[PDB]
Amino acid sequence: IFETYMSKEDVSEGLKRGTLIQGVLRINPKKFHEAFIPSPDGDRDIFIDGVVARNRALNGDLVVVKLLPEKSAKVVYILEKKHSRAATGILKLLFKKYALFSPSDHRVPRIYVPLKDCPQDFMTRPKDFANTLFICRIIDWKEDCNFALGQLAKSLGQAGEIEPETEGILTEYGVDFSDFSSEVLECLPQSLPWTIPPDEVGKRRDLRKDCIFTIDPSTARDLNDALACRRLTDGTFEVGVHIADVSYFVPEGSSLDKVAAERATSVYLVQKVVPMLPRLLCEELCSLNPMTDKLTFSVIWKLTPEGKILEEWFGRTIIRSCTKLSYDHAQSMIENPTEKIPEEELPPISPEHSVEEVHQAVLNLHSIAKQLRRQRFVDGALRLDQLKLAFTLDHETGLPQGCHIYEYRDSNKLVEEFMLLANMAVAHKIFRTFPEQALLRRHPPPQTKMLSDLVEFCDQMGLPMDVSSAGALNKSLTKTFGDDKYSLARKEVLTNMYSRPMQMALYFCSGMLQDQEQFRHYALNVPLYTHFTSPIRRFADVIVHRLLAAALGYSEQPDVEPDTLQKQADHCNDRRMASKRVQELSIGLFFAVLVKESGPLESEAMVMGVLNQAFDVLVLRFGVQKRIYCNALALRSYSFQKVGKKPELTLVWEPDDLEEEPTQQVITIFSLVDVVLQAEATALKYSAILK
RNA sequence: UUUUUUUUUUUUUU
Ligand SMILES: [Mg+2]
Numbered sequence: 001i002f003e004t005y006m007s008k009e010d011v012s013e014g015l016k017r018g019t020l021i022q023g024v025l026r027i028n029p030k031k032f033h034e035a036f037i038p039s040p041d042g043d044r045d046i047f048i049d050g051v052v053a054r055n056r057a058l059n060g061d062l063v064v065v066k067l068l069p070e071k072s073a074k075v076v077y078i079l080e081k082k083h084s085r086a087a088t089g090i091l092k093l094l095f096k097k098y099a100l101f102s103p104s105d106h107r108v109p110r111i112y113v114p115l116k117d118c119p120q121d122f123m124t125r126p127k128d129f130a131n132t133l134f135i136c137r138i139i140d141w142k143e144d145c146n147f148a149l150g151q152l153a154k155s156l157g158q159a160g161e162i163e164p165e166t167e168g169i170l171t172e173y174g175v176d177f178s179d180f181s182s183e184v185l186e187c188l189p190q191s192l193p194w195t196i197p198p199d200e201v202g203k204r205r206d207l208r209k210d211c212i213f214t215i216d217p218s219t220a221r222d223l224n225d226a227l228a229c230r231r232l233t234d235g236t237f238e239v240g241v242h243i244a245d246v247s248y249f250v251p252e253g254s255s256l257d258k259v260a261a262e263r264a265t266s267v268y269l270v271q272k273v274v275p276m277l278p279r280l281l282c283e284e285l286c287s288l289n290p291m292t293d294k295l296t297f298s299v300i301w302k303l304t305p306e307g308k309i310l311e312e313w314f315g316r317t318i319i320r321s322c323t324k325l326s327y328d329h330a331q332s333m334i335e336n337p338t339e340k341i342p343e344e345e346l347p348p349i350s351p352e353h354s355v356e357e358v359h360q361a362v363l364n365l366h367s368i369a370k371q372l373r374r375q376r377f378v379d380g381a382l383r384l385d386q387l388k389l390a391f392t393l394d395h396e397t398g399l400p401q402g403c404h405i406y407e408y409r410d411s412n413k414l415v416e417e418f419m420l421l422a423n424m425a426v427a428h429k430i431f432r433t434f435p436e437q438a439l440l441r442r443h444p445p446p447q448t449k450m451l452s453d454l455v456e457f458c459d460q461m462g463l464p465m466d467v468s469s470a471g472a473l474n475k476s477l478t479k480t481f482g483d484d485k486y487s488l489a490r491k492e493v494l495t496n497m498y499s500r501p502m503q504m505a506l507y508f509c510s511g512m513l514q515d516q517e518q519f520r521h522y523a524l525n526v527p528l529y530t531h532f533t534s535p536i537r538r539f540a541d542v543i544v545h546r547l548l549a550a551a552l553g554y555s556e557q558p559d560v561e562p563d564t565l566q567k568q569a570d571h572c573n574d575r576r577m578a579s580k581r582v583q584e585l586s587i588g589l590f591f592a593v594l595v596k597e598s599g600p601l602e603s604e605a606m607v608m609g610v611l612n613q614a615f616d617v618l619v620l621r622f623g624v625q626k627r628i629y630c631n632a633l634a635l636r637s638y639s640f641q642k643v644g645k646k647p648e649l650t651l652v653w654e655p656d657d658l659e660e661e662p663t664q665q666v667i668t669i670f671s672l673v674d675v676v677l678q679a680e681a682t683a684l685k686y687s688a689i690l691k
Numbered sequence: 692u693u694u695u696u697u698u699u700u701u702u703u704u705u
Pocket of ligand 1: 214215216223224225226
């Protein structure tokens, strides 16, 4: 049986007296018998031995623990339940007046369900539901019971199918994808089609006549930012970042505000998008669509050709985007800088602005961005980007026809450098104005122990590396023989490995953090940062807009407690990471299906680790990690030797015929090999073998 | 309750 939880006051006293420790529970997915929490000082985490010591806690919960003598601790309370208490799993079935629900997530415990709650068709033939995904909600977990009690929510459908699995990911991670309540939709404008009131135009700087445009993916539905660039007579440039003024449409403390605060961010699945706001805002009103007057909150600079700021300006504005460019369009402009492109290979453009004018703007914005970026890395910036997958979906069926590695081009970077520049400018502005109430975004450095151990590992394999800083590492991960697919492959593998010690970036209230040296963003290597440029799809930006609004005197002094503001930040962090897991799982889902439907898929891969009966590989064409087992390979024998510091795996291939002699193949780390991905019998499961 | 330890990140647009 489990242990009885502690009292509210006993715990509150414990946390206050240091005797008890707070933290976020992490459960080992490979060995669910093991759970961990971070320690306030020591770089080594605290160990939770067994499920009993976990005390019915779940992964993600903010738990309280008491230390044990000879690290090791036991859970004694749960101050905040952060797990959704909802899971995707399968139903099956002595005291047989219950059913056994098995969550796909091994971190989640198995759940008892009352048979009376179960479908009649399941009662008759449970084996019919062997591959039927249900949603189950943990309603309780008794201290005497080994399993937890739950309520069957609904049937999603067959496992492995896209839409059922999608809803499973969304629900399991607590993403609200419901229609918006009527009390929310009444906060929206009621006079449609909505036009900007005349009195506002006077209050704002009217940029509707200026050449402003947007650059986003071809499939973009919610355009948050717009850009502009003029060359001044004195050789300098006037760049402008115009963000949709969502703050205007979302009154603080309204039903619309509360649901936005809850949803915290938009979720970008592969085939669809779970929006933060209603579509009337996300896609029509706030969205900076072309050839329509839009309310914006802008940042404008007078910039050096190198991107150095000469003077800086904030203020509410109003624009009329002359065109909606895609990154492909922008790139074509950049690659053909002195050629009038056929005006049919480009999107519709407002008649009051020529294509040549926009073309020139992109070229100039590229020129500065090119310089802004190059400078950023000289100043010790870290780009640690792994391979990302993009899919091509059959519009008839929705299934994926294929996939490709997403290419991050000059047009992509163009936008990035100015969104960066804008966000920093606002970070400095609100913090300089309201030092105790600034909604900023820091990024701590890597964990000392993990990184130090990784550097040691890299000392072997003949790969000395400097990691004294973010910048030092960045140069190391771009310091290769270059040119060839091997060094590029090794680059990607090392990019992965050095991501483990890295910590997540955090929203935070300025006044709630003492040491300002911790305000730093490790990877960007800057003293201050925040999110401001994407208020349609991110609530953190909305709060910053309200703060910036107050900094310019558009509203009263902010009367929010730093405590309250941190709560918003905490929740924003929670939904942000949760959103990332979902977006990743969505990609994983579609690739699994793609592997299943498009037969076996070939690809080159690089070895990451080597064990005595298997080895891990990074599949290059897809950026997935898979383990290859010697059992699955048609081998006649295989040997494992660890001499030479690094592990090596020697394979002997069994020929299919007596004519062919057995071929040998040594597998060591950073080895380039061919692999094929075949779908297994299980849903969304596929294996890797060495071709 | 998985064919051989938690930390897989950062940045930009969606
Ligand atoms: Mg945009």
